[PDB]
Amino acid sequence: FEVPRMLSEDLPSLELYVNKMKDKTLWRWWAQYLESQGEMDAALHYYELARDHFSLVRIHCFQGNVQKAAQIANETGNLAASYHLARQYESQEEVGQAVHFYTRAQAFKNAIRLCKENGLDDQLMNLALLSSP
Amino acid sequence: QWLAENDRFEEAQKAFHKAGRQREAVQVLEQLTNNAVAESRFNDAAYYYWMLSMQCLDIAQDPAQKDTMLGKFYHFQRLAELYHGYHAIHRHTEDPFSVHRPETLFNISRFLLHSLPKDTPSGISKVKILFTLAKQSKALGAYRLARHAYDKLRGLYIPARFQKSIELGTLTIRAKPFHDSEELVPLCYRCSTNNPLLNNLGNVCINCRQPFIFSASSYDVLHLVEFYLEEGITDEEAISLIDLESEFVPVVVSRLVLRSMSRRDVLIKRWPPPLRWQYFRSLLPDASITMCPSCFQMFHSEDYELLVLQHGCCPYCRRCK
Amino acid sequence: LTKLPILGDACSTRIAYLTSLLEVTVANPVEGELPITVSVDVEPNFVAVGLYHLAVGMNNRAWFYVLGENAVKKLKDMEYLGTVASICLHSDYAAALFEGKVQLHLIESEILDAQEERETRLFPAVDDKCRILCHALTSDFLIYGTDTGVVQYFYIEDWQFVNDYRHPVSVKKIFPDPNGTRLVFIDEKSDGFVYCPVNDATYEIPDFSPTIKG
Amino acid sequence: LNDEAAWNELARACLHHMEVEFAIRVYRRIGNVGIVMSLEQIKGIEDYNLLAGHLAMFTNDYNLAQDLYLASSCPIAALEMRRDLQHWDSALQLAKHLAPDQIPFISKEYAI
Amino acid sequence: EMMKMRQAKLDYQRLLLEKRQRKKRLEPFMVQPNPE
Ligand SMILES: [Zn+2]
Ligand SMILES: [Zn+2]
């Protein structure tokens, strides 16, 4: 982290450094810094390189493509992606999808919550047995 | 020592701690904290301080030095909270981007400023706290707290990289309606009252003085009130009863009251044997709170699951998941 | 040439000096640009300049122009109610100075959901008794002077006063710093000062020449 | 220039203007060590008047130091300065106004 | 009396908690630039 501070305002020098080190923290810092400058199509590249599936899924749920987020969450098992994907469907009003995907992340307290709100009775059993005491 | 000469100092401290060492463990751990505080790793500084806190309380298991180690435990716990809070402010004023929501930074900055009145643990520069607070209060709409933040700033030496923004904000904040949005006003949960955002006495009500119970994710205000047990009552006794179904005058729940609650509405925060279990009634049982069983911090349930999933541990203690 | 009155102005690092009877030149050498011209339609009297505009008017008028990167467009030909003294264009808004009044008006205005509260305002306030001797505009402020010594900052963005100093005597010339916060003003007796509104206090400028002009 | 006294003058100026970091950089080259550590000790101070008093004391102007310290958040520091600086009469004066515990002990020290 | 207003405040802060967590849940927080 210290090097980014030093090389701030030396942005090309930073870019060289971060593209060389290949540390998956400098890569994620550069990804942050190519999402906070409105160049979202290289944030995907560097986040892809820096194995940050929660972030990729987030961006994919921002740019309307949600089939892509579904893809990046089917195979990589990163639960955080399953959470944010489920919330994306939640705002999208897909209910079965946003319930099953909370289920994926082993986050059953949100699952039971949206389940109760919808009224899915089967959900109560399916996520109460699995639920903690 | 093999790890030590192999520079694996974190594991080495863990080893001495597990090895009954109480001279090597503490010395290496304090040295590690000083290194962390020296750099910008304030979150690690907080975690190491937390380890010191629980380990020193474990040492206080010895009746010889109980009095002289509960003080150390309390001091290190307060330092742990402060540094974990200050890490977010440190990140926010350095990175060209921002990670946290504005609400969370606002709440963190207010808690810090109301818990760090006149003494600054090493590294915690309160110019940054007030700067973040002023920006965030002006953004959210608490236009009277921002006036305080700037007035307080006017008495501190400002680094040159903050002067332009602060000395222009102090001027452009007089244009705002001079009003604090009600959506941010803190509310007590023991006495109904609406404490000023800037409460001079610290984190405490005015009518009563029940200190606010803050969570550990967004440093938010919580709906938990801390009742204390009666005189001739034990923790086992109290839990038994529960399951069966102007200075400060602390509330003293008594037996027939403890038989009028349920585990749905109390959080027990079972400390180790040397201390006594402190309790927390809740006033909105419909809402939820989860208590990390290691560090006994409290979070909103929904927040705690996202946080565990994101980190793979508690964020405060990095205990297993 | 027989005679060339010396007019011109500055904003950030952008000179706009007069060339000849029918011309002006605009340049930003500091940032490495070229000289342009705007061939003003008359004999100019005042030449304000700013980030994005020029301005020249001679008797009661003001030909704004747009300082683009290629050429200039005769934006408007707006006029005023008296002898226009010294207009000052920084940023978007402009602030003419005619007969002890100052009249903050937006320049590039087409009536598209723009509150008429913002289009035009006339300092000193309608009722008070002053004559604004000197004003000077900043990134966002309408710092002006008075006769009863009132240096009122005016935050344009939220359209309210932010500062009221009160000099013993009529502040008659003002020059803000590039950042805008601090200020340098000369009173009647030729006694400079450095007003820093943050801490509301004036520091006297030692050994100030009796005939300082700028 | 490579003149020791020129560097020293630069250092005094850098102390004078509350430029702690750059003054440390200078002193670290001058070599003066008993002030490098002191400045690194007070680099954390944020209070304007307290820091003012400290950097005044480092420029061996104790009267102005007292003046500022009495306006800072921690006035007893001026007391500490007097007591270290051995001027126990001003130590009594400042203490009496601020601390009563130093009173009999600083009285004893002044008597001795 | 005091009970009524106390319960009213208890309900207000209930509602605020709801809208707060709703804001977190139904909105994403894209990394945003800072002014400085
Ligand atoms: Zn209260
Ligand atoms: Zn924990």
JSON list of N, CA and C in Angstrom, two decimals, chain B residues 106 134 136-148 173-185 194-198, chain E residues 12:
[
{"chain": "B", "resi": 106, "resn": "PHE", "atom": "N", "xyz": [-19.53, 9.23, 8.38]},
{"chain": "B", "resi": 106, "resn": "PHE", "atom": "CA", "xyz": [-20.08, 10.21, 9.29]},
{"chain": "B", "resi": 106, "resn": "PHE", "atom": "C", "xyz": [-20.19, 9.65, 10.70]},
{"chain": "B", "resi": 134, "resn": "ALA", "atom": "N", "xyz": [-16.71, 17.19, 8.72]},
{"chain": "B", "resi": 134, "resn": "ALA", "atom": "CA", "xyz": [-17.27, 18.38, 8.09]},
{"chain": "B", "resi": 134, "resn": "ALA", "atom": "C", "xyz": [-17.77, 18.06, 6.70]},
{"chain": "B", "resi": 136, "resn": "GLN", "atom": "N", "xyz": [-18.69, 15.19, 5.48]},
{"chain": "B", "resi": 136, "resn": "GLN", "atom": "CA", "xyz": [-19.82, 14.27, 5.48]},
{"chain": "B", "resi": 136, "resn": "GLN", "atom": "C", "xyz": [-21.07, 14.92, 6.06]},
{"chain": "B", "resi": 137, "resn": "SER", "atom": "N", "xyz": [-20.94, 15.73, 7.09]},
{"chain": "B", "resi": 137, "resn": "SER", "atom": "CA", "xyz": [-22.12, 16.39, 7.63]},
{"chain": "B", "resi": 137, "resn": "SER", "atom": "C", "xyz": [-22.70, 17.36, 6.61]},
{"chain": "B", "resi": 138, "resn": "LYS", "atom": "N", "xyz": [-21.84, 18.06, 5.88]},
{"chain": "B", "resi": 138, "resn": "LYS", "atom": "CA", "xyz": [-22.33, 18.95, 4.84]},
{"chain": "B", "resi": 138, "resn": "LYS", "atom": "C", "xyz": [-23.01, 18.16, 3.73]},
{"chain": "B", "resi": 139, "resn": "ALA", "atom": "N", "xyz": [-22.51, 16.97, 3.43]},
{"chain": "B", "resi": 139, "resn": "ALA", "atom": "CA", "xyz": [-23.13, 16.15, 2.40]},
{"chain": "B", "resi": 139, "resn": "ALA", "atom": "C", "xyz": [-24.47, 15.60, 2.85]},
{"chain": "B", "resi": 140, "resn": "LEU", "atom": "N", "xyz": [-24.53, 15.02, 4.05]},
{"chain": "B", "resi": 140, "resn": "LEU", "atom": "CA", "xyz": [-25.76, 14.38, 4.49]},
{"chain": "B", "resi": 140, "resn": "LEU", "atom": "C", "xyz": [-26.83, 15.37, 4.87]},
{"chain": "B", "resi": 141, "resn": "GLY", "atom": "N", "xyz": [-26.46, 16.55, 5.35]},
{"chain": "B", "resi": 141, "resn": "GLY", "atom": "CA", "xyz": [-27.44, 17.54, 5.72]},
{"chain": "B", "resi": 141, "resn": "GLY", "atom": "C", "xyz": [-27.55, 17.86, 7.19]},
{"chain": "B", "resi": 142, "resn": "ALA", "atom": "N", "xyz": [-26.53, 17.57, 7.99]},
{"chain": "B", "resi": 142, "resn": "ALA", "atom": "CA", "xyz": [-26.51, 18.03, 9.38]},
{"chain": "B", "resi": 142, "resn": "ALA", "atom": "C", "xyz": [-25.71, 19.32, 9.41]},
{"chain": "B", "resi": 143, "resn": "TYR", "atom": "N", "xyz": [-26.32, 20.39, 8.91]},
{"chain": "B", "resi": 143, "resn": "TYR", "atom": "CA", "xyz": [-25.60, 21.63, 8.68]},
{"chain": "B", "resi": 143, "resn": "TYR", "atom": "C", "xyz": [-25.26, 22.39, 9.95]},
{"chain": "B", "resi": 144, "resn": "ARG", "atom": "N", "xyz": [-25.67, 21.93, 11.12]},
{"chain": "B", "resi": 144, "resn": "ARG", "atom": "CA", "xyz": [-25.21, 22.57, 12.33]},
{"chain": "B", "resi": 144, "resn": "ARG", "atom": "C", "xyz": [-23.98, 21.91, 12.92]},
{"chain": "B", "resi": 145, "resn": "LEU", "atom": "N", "xyz": [-23.86, 20.59, 12.76]},
{"chain": "B", "resi": 145, "resn": "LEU", "atom": "CA", "xyz": [-22.65, 19.91, 13.21]},
{"chain": "B", "resi": 145, "resn": "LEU", "atom": "C", "xyz": [-21.44, 20.32, 12.39]},
{"chain": "B", "resi": 146, "resn": "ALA", "atom": "N", "xyz": [-21.62, 20.54, 11.09]},
{"chain": "B", "resi": 146, "resn": "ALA", "atom": "CA", "xyz": [-20.51, 20.98, 10.26]},
{"chain": "B", "resi": 146, "resn": "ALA", "atom": "C", "xyz": [-19.94, 22.29, 10.77]},
{"chain": "B", "resi": 147, "resn": "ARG", "atom": "N", "xyz": [-20.80, 23.17, 11.27]},
{"chain": "B", "resi": 147, "resn": "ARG", "atom": "CA", "xyz": [-20.31, 24.43, 11.82]},
{"chain": "B", "resi": 147, "resn": "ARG", "atom": "C", "xyz": [-19.39, 24.17, 13.00]},
{"chain": "B", "resi": 148, "resn": "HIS", "atom": "N", "xyz": [-19.77, 23.24, 13.88]},
{"chain": "B", "resi": 148, "resn": "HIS", "atom": "CA", "xyz": [-18.86, 22.87, 14.94]},
{"chain": "B", "resi": 148, "resn": "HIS", "atom": "C", "xyz": [-17.56, 22.33, 14.37]},
{"chain": "B", "resi": 173, "resn": "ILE", "atom": "N", "xyz": [-19.91, 27.14, 4.42]},
{"chain": "B", "resi": 173, "resn": "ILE", "atom": "CA", "xyz": [-20.90, 26.52, 5.28]},
{"chain": "B", "resi": 173, "resn": "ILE", "atom": "C", "xyz": [-21.83, 27.52, 5.93]},
{"chain": "B", "resi": 174, "resn": "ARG", "atom": "N", "xyz": [-21.51, 28.81, 5.90]},
{"chain": "B", "resi": 174, "resn": "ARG", "atom": "CA", "xyz": [-22.46, 29.75, 6.47]},
{"chain": "B", "resi": 174, "resn": "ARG", "atom": "C", "xyz": [-23.66, 29.98, 5.58]},
{"chain": "B", "resi": 175, "resn": "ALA", "atom": "N", "xyz": [-23.66, 29.40, 4.39]},
{"chain": "B", "resi": 175, "resn": "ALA", "atom": "CA", "xyz": [-24.77, 29.53, 3.47]},
{"chain": "B", "resi": 175, "resn": "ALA", "atom": "C", "xyz": [-25.85, 28.49, 3.70]},
{"chain": "B", "resi": 176, "resn": "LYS", "atom": "N", "xyz": [-25.67, 27.58, 4.64]},
{"chain": "B", "resi": 176, "resn": "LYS", "atom": "CA", "xyz": [-26.59, 26.47, 4.78]},
{"chain": "B", "resi": 176, "resn": "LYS", "atom": "C", "xyz": [-27.65, 26.76, 5.84]},
{"chain": "B", "resi": 177, "resn": "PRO", "atom": "N", "xyz": [-28.81, 26.14, 5.73]},
{"chain": "B", "resi": 177, "resn": "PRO", "atom": "CA", "xyz": [-29.97, 26.54, 6.54]},
{"chain": "B", "resi": 177, "resn": "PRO", "atom": "C", "xyz": [-29.84, 26.50, 8.05]},
{"chain": "B", "resi": 178, "resn": "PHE", "atom": "N", "xyz": [-28.68, 26.16, 8.60]},
{"chain": "B", "resi": 178, "resn": "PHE", "atom": "CA", "xyz": [-28.48, 26.16, 10.05]},
{"chain": "B", "resi": 178, "resn": "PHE", "atom": "C", "xyz": [-29.48, 25.23, 10.74]},
{"chain": "B", "resi": 179, "resn": "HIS", "atom": "N", "xyz": [-29.45, 23.96, 10.34]},
{"chain": "B", "resi": 179, "resn": "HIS", "atom": "CA", "xyz": [-30.43, 23.01, 10.82]},
{"chain": "B", "resi": 179, "resn": "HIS", "atom": "C", "xyz": [-29.88, 21.61, 10.65]},
{"chain": "B", "resi": 180, "resn": "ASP", "atom": "N", "xyz": [-30.23, 20.74, 11.59]},
{"chain": "B", "resi": 180, "resn": "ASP", "atom": "CA", "xyz": [-29.75, 19.36, 11.62]},
{"chain": "B", "resi": 180, "resn": "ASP", "atom": "C", "xyz": [-30.88, 18.44, 11.20]},
{"chain": "B", "resi": 181, "resn": "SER", "atom": "N", "xyz": [-30.64, 17.65, 10.16]},
{"chain": "B", "resi": 181, "resn": "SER", "atom": "CA", "xyz": [-31.69, 16.78, 9.65]},
{"chain": "B", "resi": 181, "resn": "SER", "atom": "C", "xyz": [-32.10, 15.78, 10.71]},
{"chain": "B", "resi": 182, "resn": "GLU", "atom": "N", "xyz": [-33.41, 15.58, 10.87]},
{"chain": "B", "resi": 182, "resn": "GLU", "atom": "CA", "xyz": [-33.89, 14.69, 11.92]},
{"chain": "B", "resi": 182, "resn": "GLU", "atom": "C", "xyz": [-33.51, 13.24, 11.68]},
{"chain": "B", "resi": 183, "resn": "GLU", "atom": "N", "xyz": [-33.22, 12.87, 10.43]},
{"chain": "B", "resi": 183, "resn": "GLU", "atom": "CA", "xyz": [-32.89, 11.48, 10.16]},
{"chain": "B", "resi": 183, "resn": "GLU", "atom": "C", "xyz": [-31.57, 11.07, 10.78]},
{"chain": "B", "resi": 184, "resn": "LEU", "atom": "N", "xyz": [-30.77, 12.02, 11.24]},
{"chain": "B", "resi": 184, "resn": "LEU", "atom": "CA", "xyz": [-29.50, 11.70, 11.86]},
{"chain": "B", "resi": 184, "resn": "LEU", "atom": "C", "xyz": [-29.48, 11.93, 13.36]},
{"chain": "B", "resi": 185, "resn": "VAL", "atom": "N", "xyz": [-30.51, 12.53, 13.92]},
{"chain": "B", "resi": 185, "resn": "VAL", "atom": "CA", "xyz": [-30.47, 12.88, 15.34]},
{"chain": "B", "resi": 185, "resn": "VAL", "atom": "C", "xyz": [-30.43, 11.62, 16.18]},
{"chain": "B", "resi": 194, "resn": "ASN", "atom": "N", "xyz": [-33.82, 13.44, 22.50]},
{"chain": "B", "resi": 194, "resn": "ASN", "atom": "CA", "xyz": [-33.13, 13.49, 21.22]},
{"chain": "B", "resi": 194, "resn": "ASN", "atom": "C", "xyz": [-31.85, 14.28, 21.42]},
{"chain": "B", "resi": 195, "resn": "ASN", "atom": "N", "xyz": [-30.81, 13.57, 21.83]},
{"chain": "B", "resi": 195, "resn": "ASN", "atom": "CA", "xyz": [-29.53, 14.16, 22.17]},
{"chain": "B", "resi": 195, "resn": "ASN", "atom": "C", "xyz": [-28.99, 14.97, 21.01]},
{"chain": "B", "resi": 196, "resn": "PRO", "atom": "N", "xyz": [-28.39, 16.12, 21.26]},
{"chain": "B", "resi": 196, "resn": "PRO", "atom": "CA", "xyz": [-27.73, 16.86, 20.19]},
{"chain": "B", "resi": 196, "resn": "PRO", "atom": "C", "xyz": [-26.71, 15.97, 19.50]},
{"chain": "B", "resi": 197, "resn": "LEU", "atom": "N", "xyz": [-26.48, 16.23, 18.21]},
{"chain": "B", "resi": 197, "resn": "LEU", "atom": "CA", "xyz": [-25.41, 15.51, 17.53]},
{"chain": "B", "resi": 197, "resn": "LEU", "atom": "C", "xyz": [-24.10, 15.67, 18.28]},
{"chain": "B", "resi": 198, "resn": "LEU", "atom": "N", "xyz": [-23.72, 16.91, 18.60]},
{"chain": "B", "resi": 198, "resn": "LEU", "atom": "CA", "xyz": [-22.51, 17.15, 19.38]},
{"chain": "B", "resi": 198, "resn": "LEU", "atom": "C", "xyz": [-22.92, 17.21, 20.84]},
{"chain": "E", "resi": 12, "resn": "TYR", "atom": "N", "xyz": [-40.58, 5.51, 15.43]},
{"chain": "E", "resi": 12, "resn": "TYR", "atom": "CA", "xyz": [-39.87, 6.33, 14.46]},
{"chain": "E", "resi": 12, "resn": "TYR", "atom": "C", "xyz": [-38.50, 5.74, 14.16]}
]
